[PDB]
Amino acid sequence: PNHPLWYTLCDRYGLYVVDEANIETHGMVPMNRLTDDPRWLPAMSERVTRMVQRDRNHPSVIIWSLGSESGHGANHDALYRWIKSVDPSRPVQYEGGGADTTATDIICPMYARVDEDQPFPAVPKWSIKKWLSLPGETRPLILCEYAHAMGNSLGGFAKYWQAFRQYPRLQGGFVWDWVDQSLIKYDENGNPWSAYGGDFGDTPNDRQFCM
Amino acid sequence: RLAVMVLRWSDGSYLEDQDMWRMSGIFRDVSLLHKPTTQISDFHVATRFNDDFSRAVLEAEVQMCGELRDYLRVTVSLWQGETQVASGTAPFGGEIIDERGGYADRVTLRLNVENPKLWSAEIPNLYRAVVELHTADGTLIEAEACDVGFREVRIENGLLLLNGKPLLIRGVNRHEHHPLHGQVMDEQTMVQDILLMKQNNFNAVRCSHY
Ligand SMILES: CC(C)S[C@@H]1O[C@H](CO)[C@H](O)[C@H](O)[C@H]1O
Numbered sequence: 196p197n198h199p200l201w202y203t204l205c206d207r208y209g210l211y212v213v214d215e216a217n218i219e220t221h222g223m224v225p226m227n228r229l230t231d232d233p234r235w236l237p238a239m240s241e242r243v244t245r246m247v248q249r250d251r252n253h254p255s256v257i258i259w260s261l262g263s264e265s266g267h268g269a270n271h272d273a274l275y276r277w278i279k280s281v282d283p284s285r286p287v288q289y290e291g292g293g294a295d296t297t298a299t300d301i302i303c304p305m306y307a308r309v310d311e312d313q314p315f316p317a318v319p320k321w322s323i324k325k326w327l328s329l330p331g332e333t334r335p336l337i338l339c340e341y342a343h344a345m346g347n348s349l350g351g352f353a354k355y356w357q358a359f360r361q362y363p364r365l366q367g368g369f370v371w372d373w374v375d376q377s378l379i380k381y382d383e384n385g386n387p388w389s390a391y392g393g394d395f396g397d398t399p400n401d402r403q404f405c406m
Numbered sequence: 407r408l409a410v411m412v413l414r415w416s417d418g419s420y421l422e423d424q425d426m427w428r429m430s431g432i433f434r435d436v437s438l439l440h441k442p443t444t445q446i447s448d449f450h451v452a453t454r455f456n457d458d459f460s461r462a463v464l465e466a467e468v469q470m471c472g473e474l475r476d477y478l479r480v481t482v483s484l485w486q487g488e489t490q491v492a493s494g495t496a497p498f499g500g501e502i503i504d505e506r507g508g509y510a511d512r513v514t515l516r517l518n519v520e521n522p523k524l525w526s527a528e529i530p531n532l533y534r535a536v537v538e539l540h541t542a543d544g545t546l547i548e549a550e551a552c553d554v555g556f557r558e559v560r561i562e563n564g565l566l567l568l569n570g571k572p573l574l575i576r577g578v579n580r581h582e583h584h585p586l587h588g589q590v591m592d593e594q595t596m597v598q599d600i601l602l603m604k605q606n607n608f609n610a611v612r613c614s615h616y
């Protein structure tokens with residue numbers, strides 16, 4: 196959940212918002228180790244329920260999200276149903292555990308390609324065009340993350356937009372991401388420079404991946 | 407002496423506008439068929455399966471024409487080569503259908519087949535079904551027959567399945583055409599076409615358009 200003024204500004208300026216619970220357990224092995232554990236349900240539940248109680252009157256919020264990169268656990272299914280029951284006015288999405296689980300109203304993969312399948316075991320990233328027409332599949336597809344804009348990037352961006360415009364159920368996505376997470380440091384003459392992972396003696400680090 | 411007056415054009419022509427040579431005449435076989443007065447007038451063969459196709463029921467509905475009689479029977483027997491695999495015998499008289507009863511001139515035979523060899527374009531396993539119309543003590547009136555392929559075709563979850571597996575149709579449309587004979591077909595040309603098709607990795611044909 197963002198600083199509260201953010202929603203006020205999106206209400207007034209006109210932007211659609213996905214409001215997202217403060218839940219990410221990316222580094223767990225496997226990713227759902229905590230989110231499939233009932234002992235962690237109370238902690239996760241408050242991160243979802245208190246968000247909804249805070250932001251539910253904001254028109255800019257159109258979609259609720261269960262968080263990010265935390266696999267798919269039974270706790271997600273439970274909290275999915277909680278929101279659906281409390282606020283029928285907004286779809287609920289969640290990408291974890293393969294982007295099309297029972298905990299999401301929208302197929303919301305990250306970095307699924309336009310034409311190329313990436314058939315990882317258990318959590319495949321299908322071509323977005325292919326994904327829509329999988330047997331039994333009926334949901335809209337909106338990428339929660341796509342076109343990773345790291346350095347000299349956005350190669351192939353037009354390929355996404357061509358597909359989005361041709362396919363009714365391909366309803367777009369959210370570029371990753373808006374602003375470089377670089378930090379200012381100063382040289383001996385007080386001149387500022389942009390710093391990334393590792394530049395503060397922080398180790399282990401992931402270097403320029405923050406930009 | 408038979409006399410046949412064949413008309414090139416009719417009201418039927420309005421439903422025969424296929425993209426092909428427009429021809430006319432007696433272009434398929436002519437034959438004479440002798441049936442007894444008491445006869446098999448129709449038969450339908452169905453094959454249903456359990457979830458893993460390890461069990462099947464062959465269901466054969468048989469219709470008769472002529473005088474209905476208590477001593478009349480149908481035997482449907484199923485053969486794999488020279489081995490009889492299953493057989494059912496029943497008098498005529500179907501189950502109740504509605505308030506006026508059922509079909510006295512019909513009977514349905516149900517045969518159990520364990521581990522049926524399944525028919526597909528990959529392995530065209532066939533059985534032979536013989537339909538015998540006979541008296542109770544076994545005088546044959548007549549027999550009809552057909553080749554039986556045990557297979558299930560269904561659409562499930564948006565997929566066309568044969569024997570539970572999604573097909574990939576390697577198909578071709580085929581008109582009935584001979585450069586010398588027009589729209590007359592012979593066994594040799596038919597066999598030639600089928601060998602060439604299978605040899606070129608085709609598994610399906612559409613009878614375009616008739
Ligand atoms: C396979 C890993 C790099 S995960 C990858 O890292 C990215 C780095 O910018 C983003 O954080 C994405 O959300 C994440 O899926």
Ligand SMILES: [Mg+2]
Pocket residue numbers: 423424425
């Ligand atoms: Mg035509």
Ligand code: NA
Pocket residue numbers: 358359360361362363364365366367
């Ligand atoms: Na679209």
Ligand code: NA
Pocket residue numbers: 399400401402
């Ligand atoms: Na490192």
Ligand code: NA
Pocket residue numbers: 404405406
């Ligand atoms: Na990053």
